[PDB]
């Protein structure tokens, strides 16, 4: 297997990843992005986001030719204590295909790219029940900065973002 | 006092760092600001900028006993979650002691979210710690909601030695 950054012509199958992570985070119903979406926020031209790949050989394809089989969504953020920071968004790889090492590969290029862009830690989040990952985590070094430090993700939806703008 | 919001410019970052050095020292983390002038200017102000800025500041008759202008701020930059939408993301949002009280905060929160609003922004997100109890209900005075709590996430880190290990593994 070997991972590499996304084409333009890798949209289809990362859709499909990105809908059976949903699906594996119970979000199936709430994704918003399209290929369209993807292929214009994804691509080369002021690029939102950065997807990696994971692709075996035809031997191990999937029931239905797909060679892609794991992803991984990423952004740059910033930290006013440490500067530049890598976000990783979304990172799955498919059920049969897990174990094999393919994530760790995915974690691998993710590292080098946070090392090439200067980037002084890694932050994602993980769901509170998803053992497997959070193990995997902490076995190459990740803490819990929730349980460490107590922050909680909150968030302000458009119908009250819309409220202050125009409460002035 | 009086005060003007407005986005910062290359020029304001001395300004920026002092506070984020503030905020670090009014939560007694200054030390670990190991971010330099040079890194916020390279960062901000370049071909990509990786985060945004909006300060707030004020009359000469005003300034800080050090003769500062600026006396809060709030850093941020734009996310996505494809579950969500793309996001505004607010870093930091502070104003200093003797500047709060006088709707500084109330504004930049206004400005921002007509920027979220400008750039087709799905929601904001920001972090508060779960002790944090007065900060907790000034956000949820504001429709917002504990998203790590009413849907289980948490937030991770793995630092830089464990990157470079990875990176140059084998
Ligand atoms: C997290 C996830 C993306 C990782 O990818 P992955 O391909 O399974 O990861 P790996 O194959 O490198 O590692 C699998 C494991 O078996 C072991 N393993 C991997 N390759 C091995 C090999 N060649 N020989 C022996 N053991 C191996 C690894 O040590 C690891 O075990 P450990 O967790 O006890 O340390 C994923 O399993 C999956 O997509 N699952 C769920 C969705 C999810 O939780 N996504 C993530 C983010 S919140
Ligand atoms: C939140 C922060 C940016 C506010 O900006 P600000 O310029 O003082 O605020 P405004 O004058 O525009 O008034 C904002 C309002 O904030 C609160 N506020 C005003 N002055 C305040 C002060 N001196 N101390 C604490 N809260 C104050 C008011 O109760 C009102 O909140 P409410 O609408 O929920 O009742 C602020 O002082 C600060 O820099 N914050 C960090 C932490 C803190 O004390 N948190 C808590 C929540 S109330
Ligand atoms: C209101 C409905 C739900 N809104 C959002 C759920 C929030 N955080 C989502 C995910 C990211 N990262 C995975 C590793």
């Given at each position: 297997?070997?991972?590499?950054?996304?084409?333009?012509?890798?949209c289809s199958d990362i859709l499909r990843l990105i809908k059976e992570l949903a699906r594996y985070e119970y979000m199936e119903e709430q994704v918003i992005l399209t290929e369209k979406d993807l292929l214009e926020d994804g691509?080369?031209?002021?690029?939102?986001?950065?997807?990696?790949?994971?692709?075996?050989?035809?031997?191990?394809?999937?029931?239905?030719?797909?060679?892609?089989?794991?992803?991984?969504?990423?952004?740059?953020?910033?930290?006013?204590?440490?500067?530049?920071?890598?976000?990783?968004?979304?990172?799955?790889?498919?059920?049969?295909?897990?174990?094999?090492?393919?994530?760790?590969?995915?974690?691998?290029?993710?590292?080098?790219?946070?090392?090439?862009?200067?980037?002084?830690?890694?932050?994602?989040?993980?769901?509170?029940?998803?053992?497997?990952?959070?193990?995997?985590?902490?076995?190459?070094?990740?803490?819990?900065?929730?349980?460490?430090?107590?922050?909680?993700?909150?968030?302000?939806?458009?119908?009250?973002?819309?409220?202050?703008?125009?409460?002035?």
């Amino acid at each position: 297997f070997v991972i590499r950054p996304a084409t333009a012509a890798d949209c289809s199958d990362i859709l499909r990843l990105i809908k059976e992570l949903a699906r594996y985070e119970y979000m199936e119903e709430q994704v918003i992005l399209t290929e369209k979406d993807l292929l214009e926020d994804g691509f080369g031209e002021h690029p939102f986001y950065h997807c990696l790949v994971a692709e075996v050989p035809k031997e191990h394809w999937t029931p239905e030719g797909h060679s892609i089989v794991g992803f991984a969504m990423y952004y740059f953020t910033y930290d006013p204590w440490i500067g530049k920071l890598l976000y990783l968004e979304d990172f799955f790889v498919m059920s049969d295909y897990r174990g094999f090492g393919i994530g760790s590969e995915i974690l691998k290029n993710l590292s080098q790219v946070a090392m090439r862009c200067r980037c002084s830690s890694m932050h994602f989040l993980v769901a509170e029940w998803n053992e497997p990952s959070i193990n995997f985590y902490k076995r190459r070094g990740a803490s819990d900065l929730s349980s460490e430090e107590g922050w909680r993700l909150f968030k302000i939806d458009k119908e009250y973002l819309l409220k202050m703008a125009t409460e002035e």
